[PDB]
From a paper:
All the inhibitors bind in a substrate-like orientation to the active site of the enzyme, forming an antiparallel β-sheet with the Ser214-Gly216 segment of α-thrombin. Thrombin's Ser195 side chain occupies its canonical position (similar to that of the unliganded enzyme) in the fPrI complex, retaining the hydrogen bond between its OG and the side chain NE2 of His57. Finally, in the fPrI complex, the carbonyl oxygen of the isoleucine residue in position P1′ establishes water-mediated hydrogen bonds with Leu41 O and Cys48 O, while its terminal amide nitrogen interacts directly with the carbonyl oxygen of the P2 proline residue and the Glu192 OE2 via a solvent molecule. Furthermore, the P1′ isoleucine side chain also makes hydrophobic contacts with Trp60D and His57. It is conceivable that the similar-sized d-Leu side chain could establish equivalent contacts with the proteinase, as indicated by the comparable Ki determined for both peptides. However, in the thrombin-fPrI complex, accommodation of the isoleucine in position P1′ implies the displacement of Lys60F, which is found in a different conformation similar to that observed in complexes of thrombin with inhibitors containing benzothiazole groups, or bulky residues (Nle or Thi) at the P1′ position. In addition, the terminal amide nitrogen of Ile points towards Trp60D, which moves further away from the catalytic site.
Prevention of pathological clot formation can be achieved by specifically inhibiting the serine proteinase α-thrombin, an enzyme that occupies a central role in the blood coagulation cascade, where it plays both pro and anticoagulant roles. In an attempt to discover new anticoagulants with lower risk of bleeding, a new generation of peptidic DTI derived from the d-Phe-Pro-d-Arg tripeptide scaffold was developed. The three-dimensional structures of three complexes of human α-thrombin with peptide inhibitors (general sequence d-Phe-Pro-d-Arg-P1′-CONH2 with l-isoleucine (fPrI), l-cysteine (fPrC) or d-threonine (fPrt) at the P1′ position) were determined by X-ray crystallography. The structure of the proteinase in all the complexes is very similar to that of the unliganded enzyme (248 Cα atoms of the heavy chain of thrombin can be aligned with a r.m.s.d. of 0.22, 0.17 and 0.12 Å for fPrI, fPrC and fPrt, respectively), with minor changes mostly in the side chain conformation of specific residues.
Author numbering:
A (entry chain L): 291 to 317
B (entry chain H): 321 to 466, 475 to 579
C (entry chain I): 1 to 4
């Protein structure tokens, strides 16, 4: 139910050092 | 992973290391898709041309890891396997079509800050996200060049159009595969490599912020060669089989 | 060939 939401990132409202690159690729 | 960087702690909490017991060695990557099911490449478990045919008690998995070699107390979990399941139409003779396997843990693993499952895509997520130019992420403890890292490596790579994938290789590509990597004109490099196979190609959904495993590191010709691309098992296309194995367990 |  909680799959794919990382305890040390999404669950704490923190982003990792390169995930922005993925987001920007969709545009 | 070629031309990647060190993962952050907990960056890929679904990452699994598949370990050979005898001799002790890293075999492959894998991914945690629930508390008791691990996804990997079939060729990690079964590849007769190189005399590979592992049984459950030949292997173990290590979950929650960061360091390639150190035992990480109170962080990592070492699990035995109850049963391996290989896709019944896995084509090891030809081109690794349907290169996918499931491994059932002997006991479910407890989740933690370091151990947490990835999502599998549904039809809409696959249709939306598996498009050329969109980037996903590959992770592993494999070779740094076509030489092993101290800690888990990560690189983001773009999905490549099928005709470009096909023109890059004489190997027969099927719709159960996709390829990813930079083109020679894009000025960036990166690839999975030997030791990374079986590990996950993941995408973060812009719609719900969840990480989905779209691919499994499957095959390639060398690593990070100009004009070559890495090939990945298309997880969504094989999902009915995954669901069947999981659903029939104990029934 | 194969990832391995
Ligand atoms: C793998 O090993 C098992 C156990 O001995 C055997 O039954 C099977 O034939 C082997 N698989 C292949 C495809 O060679
Ligand atoms: Cl299927
Ligand atoms: Na390349």
């Amino acid at each position: 139910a909680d799959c794919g939401l990382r305890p040390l990132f999404e669950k704490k409202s923190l982003e990792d050092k390169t995930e922005r690159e993925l987001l920007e690729s969709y545009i | 992973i070629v031309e990647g960087s060190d993962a952050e702690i907990g960056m890929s909490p679904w990452q699994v290391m598949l370990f050979r017991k005898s001799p002790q060695e890293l075999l492959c990557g894998a991914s945690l898709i629930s508390d008791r099911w691990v996804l990997t490449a079939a060729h990690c478990l079964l590849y007769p041309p190189w005399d590979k045919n592992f049984t459950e008690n030949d292997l173990l998995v290590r979950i929650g890891k960061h360091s390639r070699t150190r035992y990480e107390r109170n962080i990592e979990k070492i699990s035995m396997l109850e049963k391996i399941y290989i896709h019944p139409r896995y084509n090891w003779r030809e081109n690794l079509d349907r290169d996918i396997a499931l491994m059932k843990l002997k006991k479910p693993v407890a989740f933690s800050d370091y151990i947490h499952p990835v999502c599998l895509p549904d039809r809409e997520t696959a249709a939306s996200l598996l498009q050329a130019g969109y980037k996903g992420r590959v992770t592993g403890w494999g070779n740094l060049k076509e030489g092993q890292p101290s800690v888990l490596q990560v690189v983001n790579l773009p999905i490549v159009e099928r005709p470009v994938c096909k023109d890059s290789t004489r190997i027969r590509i099927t719709d159960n595969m996709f390829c990813a990597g930079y083109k020679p004109d894009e000025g960036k490099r990166g690839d999975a490599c030997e030791g990374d196979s079986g590990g996950p190609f993941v995408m973060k959904s812009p719609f719900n912020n969840r990480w989905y495993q779209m691919g499994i590191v499957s095959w390639g010709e060398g690593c990070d060669r100009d004009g070559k691309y890495g090939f990945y098992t298309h997880v969504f296309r094989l999902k009915k089989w995954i669901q069947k194995v999981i659903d029939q367990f104990g029934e | 060939x194969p990832x391995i």
